[PDB]
Design a protein around this ligand. Structure first.
Ligand SMILES: Cc1ccc(C(=O)Nc2ccc3nc(CN4CCCCC4)[nH]c3c2)cc1I
Length: 142
């Protein structure tokens, strides 16, 4: 059989009225979460957010929900996001290339923004133990 589950990747960003002592101009948050009333913790081991090299501890890990990183900084960047599964067979993780953008190139000028990216994952022939976790999370058998 085939089991599909859904992830939502997203972020929010806020232009600061005044920059931090550090000069940070934006506050931002990036997340991985399930659709409403779906508990992805059943099948997600951890979520690794790979921040820009300039960040201290750029490898940010959440082993439990919420799977998110709140930060402040100077600029947007491309953020690899690994979602590791509670799975003993391949694949044990999926990697997303997440566009963490902090403005719209002043066209138009915004002082905040939100983005959501809905992702479907398809697991062929999961083990009994991993099927239970996927379906327990609200996954659909196909
Ligand atoms: C292309 C590019 C993109 C982002 C940054 C950036 O925001 N870097 C940055 C560098 C150091 C930072 N430190 C923080 C603050 N956190 C607070 C929580 C504890 C660790 C430090 N945010 C930081 C943000 C720099 C470049 I060049």
């Amino acid at each position: 059989c085939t089991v599909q589950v859904r992830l939502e990747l997203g972020h929010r960003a806020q232009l600061r009225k005044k920059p931090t002592t550090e000069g940070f101009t934006h506050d931002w948050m990036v997340f991985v979460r399930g659709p409403e009333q779906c508990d992805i913790q059943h099948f997600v081991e951890k979520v690794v957010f790979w921040l820009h090299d300039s960040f201290p501890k750029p490898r940010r890990v959440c082993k439990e929900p919420p799977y998110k990183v709140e930060e402040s900084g100077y600029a947007g960047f491309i953020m690899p996001i690994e979602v590791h599964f509670k799975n003993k067979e391949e694949p044990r993780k999926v990697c997303f290339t997440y566009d963490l953008f902090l403005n719209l190139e002043g066209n138009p000028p915004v002082n905040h923004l939100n983005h959501l990216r809905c992702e479907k994952l398809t697991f062929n022939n999961p083990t009994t133990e991993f099927r239970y976790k996927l379906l327990r999370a609200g996954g659909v058998m196909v």
